[PDB]
Design a protein around this motif. Structure first.
Motif, PDB file in Angstrom:
ATOM      1  N   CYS D  36       8.071 -13.417 -25.434  1.00 22.01           N
ATOM      2  CA  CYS D  36       8.077 -12.383 -24.764  1.00 22.01           C
ATOM      3  C   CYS D  36       6.697 -11.527 -24.629  1.00 22.01           C
ATOM      4  CB  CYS D  36       9.282 -11.359 -24.983  1.00 22.01           C
ATOM      5  SG  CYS D  36       9.494  -9.888 -23.767  1.00 22.01           S
ATOM      6  N   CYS D  44       8.929  -3.923 -22.382  1.00 22.64           N
ATOM      7  CA  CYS D  44      10.414  -4.619 -22.467  1.00 22.64           C
ATOM      8  C   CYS D  44      11.186  -3.855 -22.978  1.00 22.64           C
ATOM      9  CB  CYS D  44      10.275  -5.926 -23.375  1.00 22.64           C
ATOM     10  SG  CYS D  44      11.629  -6.579 -23.592  1.00 22.64           S
ATOM     11  N   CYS D  50      17.199  -9.303 -24.721  1.00 24.79           N
ATOM     12  CA  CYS D  50      16.174  -9.761 -24.026  1.00 24.79           C
ATOM     13  C   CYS D  50      16.317 -11.201 -24.254  1.00 24.79           C
ATOM     14  CB  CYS D  50      14.647  -9.575 -24.650  1.00 24.79           C
ATOM     15  SG  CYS D  50      13.331 -10.060 -23.442  1.00 24.79           S
ATOM     16  N   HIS D  54      11.115 -11.822 -29.572  1.00 24.12           N
ATOM     17  CA  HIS D  54      10.325 -10.847 -30.012  1.00 24.12           C
ATOM     18  C   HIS D  54       9.863 -10.892 -31.480  1.00 24.12           C
ATOM     19  CE1 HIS D  54      12.604  -7.838 -27.107  1.00 24.12           C
ATOM     20  NE2 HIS D  54      11.970  -8.709 -26.502  1.00 24.12           N
TER      21      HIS D  54
HETATM   22 ZN   LIG Z   1      11.624  -9.021 -24.359  1.00 19.59          ZN
END
Ligand SMILES: [Zn+2]
Ligand SMILES: [Zn+2]
Ligand SMILES: [Zn+2]
Lengths: 371, 14, 1188, 110
Positions: D36, D44, D50, D54
């Motif tokens: 990401c 974010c 997500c 991360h």
């Molecule tokens: Zn993310």
RNA sequence: AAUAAA
């Protein structure tokens, strides 16, 4: 007790490696129009580099009659094996036993890799999605679990209050159906785990279920003699037709990927073929099993070839349009064979039986004495 | 067996 | 999302051949076919021997089988052609239009005949009864179609072979037998199938039956049957009438069968032991195999067999006194090409059709039992299966063309197989080799005249003067002579037998011998002379007002004669013709005229009498017939070919070019008329932007033809083969004038003027052959060629080749170390083959291998890939350097683990050896380490190396001859192709389609972006680049082309996890190689490919509005025109499995240029458009794709 | 044919994360997924749902389960998920018994 | 480290 901390000596492993055959097939197809141009393979032991995978022998499906023994795989704490399945790309073989455990074996050299406890009840069903992303299993307690390729559980819920026998996905694998000993078939939403329909009318235990490749149709087989095989509409939940194919319990019901044929196995020692467009009369009857027929599996590459297993440990091969069997072996396993699974290339077959054992079979080599 | 220099010209233009 | 497909090179490679009466019943012709093309040849026996092309046609489909039959009361044979999925067509030659005529077309495609099977693995096969009573066709392997013959055709019926007296399951071959009072069919089948791996449990599985067909009653019993035959039977051949019976071919055996005698069979090697129980004897002195052999009958008891590997054998049937076969005789005659078919033409002549090499015509004579010797007579060029291709720069180019903005490119492909392997160098345009250039501004026209055929004078016409030059050791201007210099000249040429020179001025005509004047004739017709034509003894001139006068050379001098021509309309142009072929019948002399009203006439020269008339010449009819506005500017009749036997007609009207060819037509109407007709010829030459534009030449580097000047110059050549060739010459610019030139410093050259006033002296480069669709050079290798790569820095090529050797050991992996077993057999054993690989360097200066620059691999090592790769280097100004990389694997059966190796090589420059200027290049190996698995694909991505090892993909970094791993990812079953653009990678799978990958340099992570979730057998992949859209182009096993796109916002992509198909097109060939080039349209590229049938194609992106405009034209052309064999163009290009259909068919759109202007305007109005817009759209695509 | 002067829509779509949707079930592993880019630049707002990785720091040993493709912890795994042969774990057998029976052992023999 | 040697 094994924990991977005991010193061992170097070991040479038997193997079946498909890479040379694929390379040979890739070289051959450049200058050959089809199998009409392919040179013959002599039945001599010196012709070991002339083999090609089944995709290079479309006119001779007899090459895929796997009657050569390779290896037997057994757990340390052995128990009857119920389900065997291949990973979508053929990297591993997964086994579901009566202790609720999964066992993983290497796809090239069939040796132990890992083990884990999955269910608190015997494992009954196991399937993979059409997009190769999800695995679905069910147990004797009525629970359904979601798994990923790394064997991580992300969801768990109870679908039935009794034993679940089979599950199958929809063509876009957003819906799936289950059958249970309570005598009902239910339709579920995958992403929401939400019940949508209940299909009643068998009147006894339901042992098998299947979803059509494209049309959105569901077929079920039961133990009741009045309603052995039924056809359902998943959208509305209404019944369409009833088939009086067998006079005994129906064990397996599989649909060919061409969308025309239906294969059935029963406890009256018989397997039958049907055309779903015209259900007035049968297409073919396969005789030759001395006992009950308990498992079937279509070949992934050859349209008209399949293999069947028996309750006495037999293993036979058949072709559509041929009257008698094209091969087999009387004593492959001891006890009843529960499931069969073809390798994605179609050159290896696996078996799972009640004698606490899984076995691997492959194609016969040229020049073999076969004695 | 059986399987089947440059600039050398001068122009004397009047 | 839109594109148009175009064909750049027609396919080569023949598959069927026969010998029948195609034109009439007095002569037989050789008819051959391959894929979509059909050819008819003639045998010219007084040229030596030579095959001469007579006709050629193309279809919208691939031919599966071919046969011929003679009907009742017909003057010709009729061809029976079979097309995929049970299509049968009957066609015949049409005299009068010089084309093909369709008699019937039958469809058998009801789903009930397939018995529920979806994949069809059987090809339709057509057989014809020897007496011409019926024909048979087997479809789907289970249904037999019968065509009775007498209208000439009777209604057909279908027989099911599964409901016969016996049950037929796996049919191998079927033939009609000679003799008998009814059509009798013999069938080889195998009710219980087996394969060589399981012979020990199932051995004798082949049987044979014969059925007699009753056409009227539609009944068919079985009269003869046998049951126990070897499991490895391959084909059958029917013995001719005097002996009868059938000969059955097996892999290791040969059999002869008949209805009333016991069978006779022999064994050809020792591999029959333990594999069959049939009673066979040993044939002494013979050790062969007949698994992929071709055979035909030379006599009633002699057969010619072509083995795999190319060996030729003659087999004799030894009979007793009662015509009963009792023995065989084998004779080893010669070795030849690998063939797909053969046929006997005339006593002593054979034809071998080849798909992997060049087709040959042989000649055999009995040596003084009987013995024969063979000899080659002619050959037909074939660039074979195109496996791999590379693009490079030509070694030599004249300095005058070295500042062109456009690049100069050529293609090198791998062709053939085995002993016929080769490399083919291909160019499309002709590049002249300039010797000298001169600056002479102010000239408009020029001529060369012969003064033992070396030109002696050069005449140049200025605005108001004429310049005369002698062409010998030095070129010098003449200031005093018998020529005229005070005014411009209209024409100059040779009269008589190259003994005099005629000069035509606007005021008169002059006769010259050398530089001395002999006679002068003032000419005052009321208007100045504007044109002149010269025959052998005849001279014809025309004034500006249309007045025509003629001169004759009498013993010499010139005499005046006034032609008796009517004045109903003015004459605009004319030409003269001398016929030496005999086709012009009612040496002879003729004249062609065009009138202002639009009529064309032909006359006889000694007496001006009419013999031909066309009423609407300028419109451009497809066939010109005797009937006894656009402006026409020029006409010309020439005869080309061998001995000048092929007349042609060239017309310049408006801004279009018309080409016609003459064929005889002896109509029984009228009296005293020319028995000739003309047929239009398709082409792609554009004239869109009195000096003659057509200029005939003979003997330019041994060729004769016509040069076409203008905005797009072209060469027109016809040799003794008889095929018309059109070669562009786009280098330099438009050409003003052109002339031949034969000098001591320019042996057999030519002259032409540039548009900048430069006069160039040139010769044709000598390393190419121009008697082909493209100029081509073939370099034989005598071995299989797999991969070719071009090294930019060194300007050399690397080729990976393989050759076969007998196998002697069987590797085993049972013990701790690898063990080997020595094969021990008898003296009649056939050894298996083993392949050995190598890599060598080829120089483009002289297409030869560089000595001492060869790399040899290990014993069982196979090359799986080889590419040119650009890697990071801290020694250049761009940060990248070029290398050649290869991947290998060791093949030792299914029971030994397979591992591979990675090789990285460089090409350096060293000091050349004495007496060897070619040894200045050599290899230099940097990395040759073994990996932990087989290496199957290679690529590069932003300076890194990408490799597929097993079921994983790795990225590497190279520094000081060491590879360091950076990232990896898990992938599918088997990856055999990889390509990359920027920081993205496209990977192809053998059975699981394609996928897209992305690499992040900052975090050093490799991730999957999207993939296709449906099965597909991929052949090759590439890219499509229009402006900012990126598409993925994929080949298929079913001979399709598809384009995929990544669309995250589309609802059908499930958030971007699936690739969506956006274009579809069915090409009838397999594609294994791709390459790209920019347009000759801002940021668009063209994707080219080569097929395994020897063709070349391309795909060109198009705008949406133009695509939608041309789709209507495509539909109208599909629905409003007739097509050969009655096939449907729209169904042919439909995808073979829903289709999306976003690609246009450029071969069908070419039919709009073949129509006349009247029907063009009629068709354009039906769809509400204008012909000018359609012409502009069609010509833009031709303009932007003129490469190589 | 160079493409270095063209900005494709594929690049923009990938850089802007167009079409991304939250993960359907909690606990799914983000193995084989991209990193990401928004998270590294204080963006974010998606938490643990997500679809992209991360990345947290302080990792110096390669995860052995991730090499076999059987890692269950995913983002919470405390071992490095990069292909670096210099940071492999030490061999157990070579350090406890003094010898290793694997000729192609990838673990460090110190 | 969760069975790296089953
Ligand atoms: Zn993310
Ligand atoms: Zn981890
Ligand atoms: Zn170690």
């Amino acid at each position: 007790t094994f924990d991977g901390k005991r010193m061992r000596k170097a070991v040479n492993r038997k193997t079946i490696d498909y890479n040379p055959s694929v390379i040979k097939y890739l070289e051959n197809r450049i200058w050959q129009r089809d199998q009409r141009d392919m040179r013959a393979i002599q039945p001599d032991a010196g012709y070991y580099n002339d083999l090609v995978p089944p995709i290079g022998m479309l006119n001779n499906p007899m090459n895929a009659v796997t009657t050569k023994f390779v290896r037997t795989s057994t757990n340390k704490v052995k128990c009857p094996v119920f389900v065997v399945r291949w990973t979508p790309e053929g990297r591993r073989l997964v086994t579901g036993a009566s202790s609720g455990e999964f066992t993983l074996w290497n796809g090239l050299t069939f040796n132990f890799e890992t083990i884990l406890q999955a269910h608190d009840s015997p494992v009954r069903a196991m399937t993979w999605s059409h997009n190769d992303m999800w695995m679905l299993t069910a147990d004797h307690g009525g629970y359904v679990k979601y798994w990923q390729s790394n064997m991580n559980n992300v969801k768990m819920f109870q679908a039935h209050k009794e034993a679940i026998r089979e599950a199958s996905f929809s063509p876009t694998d957003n819906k799936f159906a289950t059958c249970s000993d309570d005598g009902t078939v239910r339709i579920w939403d995958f992403l929401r785990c939400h019940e949508e329909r209940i299909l009643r009318g068998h009147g006894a235990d339901v042992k098998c279920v299947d979803w059509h490749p494209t049309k959105g149709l569901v077929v079920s087989g039961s133990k009741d003699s009045q309603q052995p095989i039924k056809f359902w509409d998943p959208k509305t939940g209404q019944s369409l037709a009833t088939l009086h194919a067998h006079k005994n319990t129906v064990m397996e019901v599989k649909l060919n990927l061409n969308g025309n044929w239906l294969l059935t196995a029963s406890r009256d020692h018989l397997c039958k073929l049907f055309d779903i467009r015209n259900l007035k009369e049968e297409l073919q009857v396969f005789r030759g099993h001395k006992k009950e027929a308990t498992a079937v599996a279509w070949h992934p590459v050859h349209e008209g070839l399949f293999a069947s297993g028996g309750s006495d440990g037999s293993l036979l091969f058949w072709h559509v349009g041929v009257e008698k069997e094209v091969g087999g072996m009387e004593m492959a396993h001891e006890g009843m064979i529960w499931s069969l699974a073809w390798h994605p290339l179609g050159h290896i077959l696996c078996s799972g039986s009640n004698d606490h054992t899984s076995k691997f079979w492959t194609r016969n080599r040229p020049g073999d004495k076969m004695r | 067996d059986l399987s089947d220099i440059k600039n050398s010209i001068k122009l004397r233009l009047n | 999302m839109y594109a148009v497909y175009k064909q750049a090179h027609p396919p080569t490679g023949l598959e069927f051949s026969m010998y029948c009466n195609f034109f009439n019943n007095s002569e037989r012709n050789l008819v051959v076919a391959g894929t979509s093309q059909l050819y008819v040849y003639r045998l010219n026996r007084d040229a030596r021997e030579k095959l001469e092309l007579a006709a050629s046609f193309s279809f919208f489909g691939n031919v599966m089988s071919m046969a011929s039959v003679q009907l009742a009361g017909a003057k010709r044979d009729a061809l029976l052609l079979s097309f995929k999925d049970a299509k049968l067509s009957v066609v015949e030659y049409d005299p009068g239009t010089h084309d093909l005529k369709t008699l019937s077309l039958h469809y058998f495609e009801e789903p009930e005949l397939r018995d529920g099977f979806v994949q069809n693995v059987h090809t339709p096969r057509v057989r014809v009864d020897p007496d011409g009573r019926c024909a048979a066709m087997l479809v789907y392997g289970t249904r037999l179609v019968v065509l009775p013959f007498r209208s000439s055709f009777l209604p057909s019926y279908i027989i099911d072979v599964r409901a016969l007296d016996e049950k037929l399951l796996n049919i191998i071959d079927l033939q009609f037998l000679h003799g008998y009072y009814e059509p009798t069919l013999l069938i080889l089948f195998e009710p219980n199938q087996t394969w060589p791996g399981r012979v020990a449990v199932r051995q004798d599985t082949c049987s044979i039956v014969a059925i007699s067909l009753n056409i009227t009653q539609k009944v068919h019993p079985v009269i003869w049957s046998l049951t126990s035959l070897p499991f490895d039977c391959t084909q059958a051949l029917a013995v001719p009438k005097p002996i009868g019976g059938v000969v059955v071919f097996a892999v290791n055996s040969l059999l002869y069968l008949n209805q009333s005698v016991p069978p006779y069979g022999v064994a050809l090697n020792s591999l029959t032991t333990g594999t069959t129980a049939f009673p066979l004897r040993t044939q002494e002195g013979v050790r062969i195999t007949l698994d992929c052999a071709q055979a035909t009958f030379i006599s009633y008891d002699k057969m010619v067999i072509s083995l795999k590997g190319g060996e030729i054998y003659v087999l004799t049937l030894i009979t007793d006194g009662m015509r009963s076969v009792r023995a065989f005789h084998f004779d080893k005659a010669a070795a030849s090409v690998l063939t797909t078919s053969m046929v006997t033409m005339e006593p002593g002549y054979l034809f071998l059709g080849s798909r992997l090499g060049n087709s040959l015509l042989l000649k055999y004579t009995e040596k003084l039992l009987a013995t024969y010797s063979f000899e080659v007579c002619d050959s037909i060029l074939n660039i074979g299966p195109c496996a791999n291709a590379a693009v490079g720069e030509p070694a030599f180019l004249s300095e005058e063309f070295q500042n062109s903005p456009e690049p100069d490119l050529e293609i090198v492909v791998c062709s053939g197989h085995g002993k016929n392997g080769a490399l083919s160098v291909l160019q499309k345009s002709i590049r002249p080799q300039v010797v000298t250039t001169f600056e002479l501004p102010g000239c408009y026209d020029m001529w060369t005249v012969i003064a033992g055929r070396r030109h002696g004078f050069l005449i140049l016409s200025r605005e108001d003067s004429t310049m005369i030059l002698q062409t010998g050791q030095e070129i010098m201007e003449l200031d005093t002579s018998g020529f005229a210099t005070q005014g411009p000249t209209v024409f100059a040429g040779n009269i008589g037998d190259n003994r005099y020179i005629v000069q035509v001025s606007p005021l008169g005509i002059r006769l010259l011998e050398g530089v001395n004047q002999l006679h002068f004739i003032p000419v005052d017709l009321g208007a100045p002379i504007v044109q002149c034509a010269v025959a052998d003894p005849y001279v014809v001139i025309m004034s500006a007002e249309g007045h025509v006068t003629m001169f004759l050379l009498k013993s010499h001098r010139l005499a005046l004669h006034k032609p008796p021509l009517h004045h109903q309309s003015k004459v605009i142009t004319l030409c003269l013709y001398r016929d030496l072929s005999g086709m012009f019948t009612t040496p002879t002399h003729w004249c062609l005229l065009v009138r202002e009203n639009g009529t064309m006439e032909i006359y006889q020269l000694p007496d001006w009498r009419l013999v031909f008339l066309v009423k609407n010449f300028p419109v451009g009819q497809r066939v010109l017939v005797d009937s006894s506005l656009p402006l026409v500017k020029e006409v010309l009749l020439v005869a080309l070919g061998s001995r000048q036997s092929r007349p042609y007609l060239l017309v310049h009207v408006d801004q279009e070019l018309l080409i016609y060819e003459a064929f005889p037509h002896d109509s029984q109407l009228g009296q005293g008329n020319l028995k000739v007709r003309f047929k239009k010829v398709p082409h792609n030459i554009n004239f869109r932007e009195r000096v003659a534009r057509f200029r005939y030449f003979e003997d330019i580097y041994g060729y004769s033809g016509v040069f076409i000047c203008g905005p797009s110059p072209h060469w027109l050549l016809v040799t003794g083969r008889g095929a018309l060739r059109l070669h562009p010459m786009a280098i330099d610019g438009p050409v003003d004038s052109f002339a031949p030139f034969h000098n001591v410093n320019c042996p057999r050259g030519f002259l032409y003027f540039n548009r900048q006033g430069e006069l160039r002296i040139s010769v044709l480069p000598a390393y190419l052959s121009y008697d082909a669709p493209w100029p081509v050079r073939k370099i034989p290798l005598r071995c299989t060629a797999h991969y070719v790569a071009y090294h930019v820095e060194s300007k050399v090529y690397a080729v990976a080749t393989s050759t076969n050797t007998p196998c002697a050991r069987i590797p085993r992996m049972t013990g701790e170390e690898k063990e080997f077993e020595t094969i021990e057999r008898d003296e009649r054993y056939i050894h298996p083959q083993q392949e050995a690989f190598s890599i060598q360097l080829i120089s483009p200066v002289s297409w030869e291998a560089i000595p001492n620059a060869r790399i040899e691999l290990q014993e069982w090592e196979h090359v799986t890939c080889m590419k040119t790769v650009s890697l990071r280097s801290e020694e250049t100004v761009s940060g990248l350097k070029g290398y050649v990389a290869a991947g290998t694997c060791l093949m030792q059966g299914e029971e030994v683990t397979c591992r591979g190796r990675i090789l990285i090589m460089d090409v350096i420059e060293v000091v050349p050896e004495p007496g060897q200027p070619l040894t200045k290049n050599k290899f230099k190996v940097l990395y040759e380490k073994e990996q932990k698995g087989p290496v199957t694909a290679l690529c590069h991505c932003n300076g890194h190396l990408v490799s597929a090892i097993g079921q994983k993909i790795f990225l590497w970094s190279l520094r000081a001859s060491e590879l360091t791993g950076m990232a990896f990812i898990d992938t599918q079953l088997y990856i055999h192709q990889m390509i990359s653009v920027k920081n993205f990678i496209l990977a192809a799978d053998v059975m699981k389609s394609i996928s897209l990958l992305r690499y992040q340099e900052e975090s050093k992570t490799l991730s999957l972006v999207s993939r296709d979730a449906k099965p597909l057998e991929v052949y090759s992949v590439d890219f499509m680049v229009d402006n900012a859209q990126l598409g993925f182009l994929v080949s298929d096993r079913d001979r399709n082309l598809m384009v995929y796109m990544y669309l995250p916002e589309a609802k059908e992509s499930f958030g971007g996890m699936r690739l969506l198909r956006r274009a579809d097109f069915h090409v009838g060939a397999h594609v294994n190689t791709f390459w790209r080039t920019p347009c000759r349209w801002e940021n668009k590229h063209i994707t080219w490919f080569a097929t395994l049938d020897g063709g070349i194609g391309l795909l060109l992106p198009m705008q949406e509005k133009t695509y939608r405009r041309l789709l209507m034209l495509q539909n109208a052309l599909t629905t409003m025109l007739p097509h050969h064999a009655g096939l449907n163009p729209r169904a042919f290009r439909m995808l073979h499995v829903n289709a999306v259909r976003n690609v246009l068919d450029g071969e069908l759109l070419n039919r709009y240029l073949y129509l006349s202007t009247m029907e063009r305007s009629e068709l354009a109005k039906k769809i509400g458009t204008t012909p000018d817009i359609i012409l502009d759209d069609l010509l833009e695509t031709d303009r932007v794709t003129a490469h190589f | 044919a160079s493409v270095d002067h063209i900005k494709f829509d594929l690049e923009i779509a990938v850089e802007q994360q167009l079409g991304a949707q939250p993960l359907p079930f909690p606990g799914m592993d983000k193995s084989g997924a991209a990193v990401c880019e928004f998270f590294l630049k204080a963006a974010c707002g998606k938490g643990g749902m997500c679809p992209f990785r991360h990345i947290s720091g302080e990792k110096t040993v390669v995860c052995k389960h991730w090499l076999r493709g059987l890692c269950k912890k995913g983002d919470q795994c405390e071992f490095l998920h990069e292909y670096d042969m210099t940071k492999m774990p030490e061999c157990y057998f070579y350090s406890k018994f003094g010898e290793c029976s694997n000729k192609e052992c990838p673990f460090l023999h110190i």
